Symmetry: D2
Subunit: 331 residues, 4 copies
């Protein structure tokens, strides 16, 4: 009967750009005007859709948590009026936004698909045409009530993604979890277990910028350098350590970590490996919390989320190791 | 016969069983090798095993240990046809990357390897990795510091430990292997690293105050300022995609101030593979690290900072392909 | 002015209509649908002309007479177009592509054979993708060979085989890389071009030929093999073990030697999925010719080609081991 | 006491020696070498006994009589060992593994068929790896089926095919995952076990059978197909397009119908590298669908069925049924 309706927020990215002598430039309303002339987007199988183009568009490499907040407020404001949501985003920080939204939205009961493209919709052979058409179709026909990220013909759990390549071509990966859905000839919903969720109405949590350090451990890293990473105003520190979560055993380094936790800093340990989980023991005794197999993006946004709420340090430390939105694999 | 020198620094490969799991045991690897006939066959090279004391867990290693290994290779260089460095997997890629810079005009193979299972166990990858490393160092000599794992010989300064949970795996995201060790060993057409024509030159290396950090949405100038406080001499930034980062004045100002103080700031990508292509950061004095791995960049800075080089020369050298660690424009 | 491509719509799912019973061929449907798709009429796309065959053919019903018809169609329109696209059903698409490669000599324009598993008219169709790309590639990245386009790759026609059909269609070129890849950015690969003379195009005739294609297995009897070689058989393709090994019992080898004495051309291919046969001397001493790394499709069509030219048996045996059109990797 | 494994060295390069002429078979060389390799005598390894065939079998020259001899060897030593390893040349290893899967019924101990590209004597040999692993898996990760071990994978025997031989040997199980992976840590996969009965072991006889295995192509003549079906042929395996499609010209279909009408069992397989046949015209001509069976499994299954005293309707029904895990039921 009456078609489903999808809300499309064009927050930024190359999709709506137009050809000029100076090259491709953002042109207000160009995305909307083009879609009006493409019959494939108006077929009976396709949902109705409304585009809200951001003014001005966001350059994803210059985004901040204030922008994540603005996007969530947009979703909240239009939630009861649409059946799903598609967030068009620049690729550079798309995974960060998708991860942050997954924590900010609690008890989500409609699909929120973050996507984008390397090539503008206007170009003959455009991934923008493919990604937007599929995102709209999947949001309407194969709804999954999570914040997802669609790219390279796969629908990933948002807080499990990372931009894996950018030089010459854009590619995203979900290193520690299979996709939730594959969009090939035939759309296939995979048997990937759904994310945890409560049974009430949607809750949209606020988020604000937070002073977090994200650093990589290397042979001989000095306590003096680590001390700097932990100075005010730092509230949390994400350490990327070796293999399953190993680090140098020298006392000076470990004492800087212990003293930081003593004064309320949340220290979390992630692996330097491309995939796999941290299996925590010397760091553990210094107050460091294991981040299991969370991506850097999920860990960084999860900390922003927890620190932005009215929560004490020990509750934050406990929450960081719990699977709140499908971002980590429990032991 | 050819003769290979084995620096046994430590690592799981030489450990033995106990009531409390695998433990380091002095002399265990040597004893086991003496009892395995396949290592003493006519087709294998003669070899010498030098056990380090103490044996090192690779996660405990420092640049001082890299220096000790380089000194060992230097002292025995003219007496052997190649070298094999047995190492723990956790920081194996850092050691291989460091040695590639410390050794200049290398004219013999130096293969770093190890295993996830002790050599003495049934079905050990340790037996396979040592047998192949010895055979390859003697017969398919590639005059570079390489890393052997998962039956592939990679350029050392192009590697990173890609997995460790359940199984160990190494990757060379931006360069194909130099050789593959399947049924038939095959040297690949991967172009050899740049090299001079003189005698081997071994450079010293010492620990250096370097920061390695990741850029994220909204990262504060206050936090970045802390990353650049003394004693920091260099900062490695892992930025978005082809090397993009926030353009807010405060953030860029902190990086500019750091470069004014003589700090070398290098830009790498957060992506798993690909090159950084340098504009706002460039104006703030940031140097592009092309497609270098974090291990290569970190050890390269340790190498340059440990020599008697001025800041401007270090900045120029960081973007140059010195040992095959980066893909030039 | 714009490039102009001739499209021979021989049959196949690509131009069919969806119905309650399944996919059905409908005269004029493909042309009706393409006139309604703006992307096919953009400045960047070539002009094209569609010749719908009457009747439309189910590729599993095709014979060499149909290959002849297609070659005659290409020949009749050769001077008036810049390239050709042959729309075909997937089941025997590789046979047609292989056959055309031998029938056309000194080809100086692209001939791309393609099709799809989903009709072009459907939403998310690979048919729309394959036709758009075939037209664009034939016009802009011309490769003067009979090629086959599928799964976003342009393969040398006489190197292809349909590798899968259950649930999804897939083609493979087991012994040669593609000639071009069509991802975000179309990329011509360094695969060496097929050999060719420097004269005018020559179109050779082809007719059905009595050929046997059989598989060797343990204990295969001389009596059964004798039957495979009875008149009217002119050639027999043997699929033997590994690098080309077969039973060495006298009765078996005698039947093969008697066949070569009768003027039958016996060719040896491997049962393996890829790789070359390397002639071991028992089969070659019985007069068997090695087919190197040729696909069954190339070997079968190559024999049809050579037998249709009325050449001497010795000439045919010699030609089978020669790389005539890029179908084989010489020693 | 350790488990004990019976090793039949039927043929293949594994026990060959080095001479100024290449690899040559030397009687007893495999056994002599293994006695000097400590890794094969460790506490973790089973005891084993080697029965070297005299002469060795050239796998490319094997016949069903050889399959019978191997089966009789297993039968004769079945009650005395905990598992079995069959060393075989690679060219027809998949045929032997497939045939044995049908000949052995109610198998209650592992039977692993394996071999190597390189003799065990050579420095870097896959022979050392394959025999060590086969022995260890047969004793410790027993799977009561006829399996084939190669490329560090343990496949269901009747699902395998030799996929490559030029430069390097490789086997594949196109339509079923391996039953076990022998990587750094041995891992048994969740691949559902093959169907089996409850009684004691039954060893079925097998003899050579007149079977044609042919490939369909555009315009294939009714005359040629008629020749394929001439006496003494009892069965014909057709490899047709995609999911089982073939030409529908009446002369072609009529030759197949006539063959079936005189008792010839005609089975349809795909020309594709993987996948099932789904079947239309051929079905009406008496052709039986072989689902996703390999040529190897279909050819040996026919040898098995034709070698028993069975009516043709029973043989036809059995060909489409999953008897030993060789095919995926609809």
């Amino acid at each position: 009967m009456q078609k489903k309706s999808i809300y499309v927020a064009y927050t930024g990215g190359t999709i709506g750009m137009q050809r000029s002598e100076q090259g491709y430039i953002p042109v207000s309303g160009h995305l909307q005007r083009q879609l009006a002339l493409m019959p494939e987007f108006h077929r009976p199988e396709m949902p109705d859709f409304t585009i809200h183009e951001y003014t001005p568009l966001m350059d994803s490499s210059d985004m901040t948590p204030e922008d994540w907040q603005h996007i969530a407020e947009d979703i909240k404001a239009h939630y009861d009026d649409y059946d799903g949501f598609v967030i068009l985003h620049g690729t550079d920080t798309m995974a960060y936004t998708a991860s942050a939204l997954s924590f900010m939205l609690e008890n989500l009961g409609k699909p929120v698909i973050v996507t984008g493209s390397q090539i503008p919709l206007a170009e003959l052979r455009s991934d923008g045409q493919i990604n937007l058409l599929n995102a709209l179709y999947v949001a309407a026909n194969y709804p999954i009530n999570e914040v997802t990220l669609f790219f390279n013909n796969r629908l990933y759990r948002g807080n499990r993604t990372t931009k894996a390549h950018a030089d010459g071509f854009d590619a995203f990966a979900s290193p520690n979890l299979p996709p939730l859905l594959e969009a090939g000839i035939h759309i296939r919903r995979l048997n990937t277990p759904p994310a945890p969720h409560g049974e009430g109405e949607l809750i949209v949590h606020p988020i604000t910028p937070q002073p977090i350090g994200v650093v990589t451990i290397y042979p001989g890293i000095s306590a003096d350098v680590v001390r700097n990473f932990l100075r005010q105003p730092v509230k949390a520190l994400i350490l990327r350590s070796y293999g399953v979560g190993n680090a140098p055993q020298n006392k000076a380094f470990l004492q800087e970590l212990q003293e930081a936790s003593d004064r309320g800093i949340v220290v979390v340990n992630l692996t330097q490996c491309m995939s796999g989980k941290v299996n925590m023991n010397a760091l553990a005794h210094a107050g460091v919390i294991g981040g299991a197999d969370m991506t850097v993006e999920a860990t960084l946004t999860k900390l922003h989320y927890l620190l932005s709420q009215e929560l004490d340090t020990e509750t934050i430390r406990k929450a960081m190791s719990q699977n709140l939105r499908g971002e980590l694999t429990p032991d």
